[PDB]
Amino acid sequence: MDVLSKGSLKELLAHLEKTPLEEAISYRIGTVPYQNVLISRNEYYNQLYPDTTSLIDGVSREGQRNVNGLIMSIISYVVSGSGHYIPNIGFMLLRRSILDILTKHDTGLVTNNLNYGIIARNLTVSKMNCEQRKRMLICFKLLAYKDGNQNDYEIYLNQNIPLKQIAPNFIPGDMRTVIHNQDQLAIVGIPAYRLTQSTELSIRDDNAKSYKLGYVDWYNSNSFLRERSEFNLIRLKDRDTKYGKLNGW
């Protein structure tokens, strides 16, 4: 919910710096990812409604124990709000931030063998919307810069024409590029249209609307932080600053 609310590149990377990896990993068993299932949608149909479960749903799924599953759990958390079930990763890796895993070699995780095409296909890039594809491409660029695979990232964009048009423009080592970026990455937000307490047909759409309706409740909740009215009560370390720089950028 909090990760889906971020609407700018600066906010997204700032959230990932303060968020540990354990938030990406889920400890609920879930179900196997790719299955043709029948779900109940009584608002629309009397018969059961066919659908296919996927990894970018908002509900936890079972994940492979390899490094591929860990990266695929991080991206699903960013684009869908929930991760997958990969237990016994370890204290050392789980305490690191999401940005450290994606960008830093000191974590101890080796990810240079990853194939962006296979990861995108397993995440069902075809079913993703524009904001979801932009968020995943941000994760790919950070991984490419960590492994020195910038050339491979560009070629993968050349093969996929729709991905090249929406590819965010920022150098993963320079903070000046992040501040200038004006891409809108928000998935949930205050809706200008009429939003009703009604169900959706597919699993992805229904789960997304739950976060959208939950965010509205979160926005008016006491947990939400109102910068306009309570800026002085925020701690100085985590207070918003114009000259905000990620470490090493």
């Binding site: 560009e154 050349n158 024409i161 090249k164 048009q165 590819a167 423009n169 590029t177 200038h180 970026n181 004006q182 891409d183």
Partner: protein, 298 residues
């Protein structure tokens, strides 16, 4: 059967898919307008004792005041235009310029980014294929004017099939000696020097006697929608310049003698309708590059 085709029509490379939105099209139009004023302001200052008109024009274009000991390069607008030209030519070229810089530079002038309010005529001759029987030789030479030299060493007359595509509007055929040409499965008319043909009519059959060589000269006219500010003379010189400074040097791309050949070759691809829209924006950008670089050589 032997197949002969025009050289420039072979394997058009994919063009870039970036900077084709309405915001980016406005920036290209703005750059063309500000480049035109840079040329005019330099000439006015040359014919006067004051440099104020050139200082004002360069300051708006480059966002910096000119200095005596520093090279006048054009500033951020020059860098943005140079990189944007690179992206249009090839899909393999990266998209370096941020959208924020493009939007900010587009706010310097007030021009619509419309790219379809006018039209232009391009003179390349699209000979897609010429099919000839055995014991005959066919040679195709030239792009602006296509000369086909054909010889018949066989016993009898031979029928040659000419395919001019479906994009060109009018093709004018001229021969060294009178010859016979007709559409497929149609009676053949009397021999005459000149033929006006619509390429949509179909493949054309030419009767080739065994006596002497017959050379057919082809000229074609095709109409492509362009912005009103389009000027063919400035685009062609801008095309030649951008190739010289290496703006088109990128792996796995084709090279063309003129912008006329480039736009016609891409039009004849499978997705030619989608490709010409990007090439038109490239032409206007090449027009701005010509004027800007002539005023500020580096």
């Amino acid at each position: 059967a032997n197949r002969a085709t025009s050289a420039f029509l072979d394997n058009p490379h994919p063009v870039g898919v970036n900077y084709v939105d309405e915001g980016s099209r406005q920036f290209v139009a703005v750059a063309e307008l500000l480049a035109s004023k840079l040329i005019d302001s330099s000439r006015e200052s040359d014919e006067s004792n004051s440099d104020v008109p050139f200082v004002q024009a360069y300051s708006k274009f480059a966002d910096d005041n000119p200095r005596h000991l520093r090279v006048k390069t054009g500033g951020k607008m020059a860098n943005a235009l140079t990189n944007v030209i690179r992206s249009y030519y090839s899909i393999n070229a990266p998209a370096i310029v941020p959208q924020v810089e493009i939007d900010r530079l587009a706010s310097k002038a007030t021009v619509s980014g419309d790219m379809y309010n006018s039209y232009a005529i391009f003179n390349s001759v699209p000979i897609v294929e010429v099919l000839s029987p055995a014991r005959t030789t066919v040679s195709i030479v030239g792009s602006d004017r296509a000369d086909v030299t054909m010889l018949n060493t066989g016993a009898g007359a031979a029928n040659i099939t000419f395919n001019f595509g479906q994009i060109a509007e009018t093709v004018i055929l001229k021969g060294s000696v009178p010859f016979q040409l007709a559409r497929l499965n149609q009676p053949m008319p009397a021999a005459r020097f000149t033929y006006k043909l619509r390429p949509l009519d179909g493949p054309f059959i030419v009767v080739l006697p065994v006596g002497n060589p017959l050379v057919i000269s082809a000229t074609a006219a095709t109409r492509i929608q362009v912005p009103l500010a389009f000027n063919k003379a400035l685009v062609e010189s801008g095309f030649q310049t951008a190739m010289n400074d290496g703006l088109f040097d990128i792996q796995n791309v084709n090279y063309y003698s003129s912008f006329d050949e480039f736009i016609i070759s891409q039009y004849h691809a499978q997705d030619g309708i989608n490709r010409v829209s990007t090439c038109v924006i490239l032409g206007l950008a090449l027009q701005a590059y010509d004027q800007m670089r002539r005023a500020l050589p580096v």
